Amino acid sequence: VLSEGEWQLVLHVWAKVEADVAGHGQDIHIRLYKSHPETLEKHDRFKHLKTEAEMKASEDLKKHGVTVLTALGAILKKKGHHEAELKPLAQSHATKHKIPIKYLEFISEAIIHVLHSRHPGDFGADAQGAMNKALELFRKDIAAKYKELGYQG
């Protein structure tokens, strides 16, 4: 649904994330947990972290951020052909972690906020539009996989 040109913008900005995976991971999760504190209760391994300082001091959270962004980066680089990458993710998030689709909108907001926060120059109107479209397709496809697993999250 994205043009080849929009995908180049998504991957261009993604390389900036890859220059600091762990720092982007942290900032996205702190944003997620600070703005949507109910998501913290679904991150049972992190729910004891109540302050942004406790969160930034958690090397465990920092590691998880790398795991999330690494997985998300692999999806974005497939330019929409991510069936195989989304399958394990939908399986675990729908059946094991029980993360609703709405929480994916929340982390999507957080990703975009952090990207603009760190790269206001490269992440302009067009890049934001493309990244929003890419994250939108990601949630759309993963919601379809949720239903196929019988969980509508």
Ligand code: HEM
């Ligand atoms: C872009 C969106 C997301 C991506 C790419 C992502 C990716 C991952 C990956 C790769 C794992 C480890 C393997 C697995 O169990 O599937 C994981 C674990 C997990 N994710 Fe997600 N995730 C996303 C969003 C979320 C959100 C919004 C939550 C809400 C709290 C969440 C909750 C969890 C939990 C609870 C685990 C298990 C961690 C543990 O207890 O060790 N995920 N995620």
Ligand SMILES: [O]
């Ligand atoms: O995650």
